[PDB]
């Protein structure tokens, strides 16, 4: 429907915390790992080095988990799970699960149009 959220969504950091030295080594993955070496520049927070996540970066409680379309996401797998958003259609949007087939996607997209529930990936498959 029309999103009920009116407070502007601000992000303290639209940027990922990539694991230190994952650029240097192919086998190191980008998922954050807290450095723990005794001499670590990144652990010791020298300027110019990789940044470390902390609780001060957290987002406003009123706007956290809201998608860019100002709705909050709920993943459905069939029609019955989609019926649960009819009373929350102004605050929640529906995403059809990744493994739901094209036949059932038609049924969920039809029922959500009747109920005025927004489906984020209704044009898929």
């Amino acid at each position: 429907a029309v999103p009920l959220l009116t407070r502007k969504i601000v992000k303290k950091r639209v940027k990922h915390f990539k694991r230190a030295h994952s650029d240097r080594y192919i086998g190191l993955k980008q998922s954050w790992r807290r450095p723990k070496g005794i001499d670590s520049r990144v652990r010791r927070k020298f300027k110019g080095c990789t940044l470390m996540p902390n609780i001060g970066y957290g987002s406003d409680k009123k706007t956290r988990h809201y998608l860019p379309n100002k709705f909050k996401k709920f993943v459905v797998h069939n029609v019955s799970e989609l019926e649960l958003l009819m009373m929350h259609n102004r605050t929640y949007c529906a995403e059809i699960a990744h493994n739901v087939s094209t036949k059932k996607r038609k049924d969920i997209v039809e029922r959500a149009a009747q109920l005025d529930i927004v489906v984020t990936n209704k044009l898929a498959r």
Binding site: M87, R90, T91
Partner: protein, 175 residues
Amino acid sequence: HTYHRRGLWAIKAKHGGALPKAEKPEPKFYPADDVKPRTVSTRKPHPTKLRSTITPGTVLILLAGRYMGKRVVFLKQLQSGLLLITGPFKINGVPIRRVNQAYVIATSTKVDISKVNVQKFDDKYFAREPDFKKDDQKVIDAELIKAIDAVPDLKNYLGARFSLRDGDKPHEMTF
């Protein structure tokens, strides 16, 4: 720095204010979320203050828009707060327009416009929605060209655009 609510009087407004008890005033749909209804706001936003150097008949240089630098005579300040200006349309080709108080500079040169009628010109006249506009413009210059001819060289002054040249410091110029 006046304290309007300096005294607990509140009765110089409603002197005969001893009045009786107030009388307080199907949806066909229920919105599923308690949304406070939107009523019109009862706040008066205190209309904008005119710059003290802008007085009726004073000359203005336009600072932006398609008429940037046009030397123009000031007529009136509209209810919305935009100044009413005319070129006049004969000398510099600037028609009757309303301009923001910013984007103009008030010079110290003045013109008498006392015997000029600018009454039908107001915010509604400029509502976004022409032959009669040509007539109104035509009948407002001939009431103003003569007063421009009254002062020597004022006609060629109003028909020239203001510009900054080499070595010109806008923060030192008197205007």
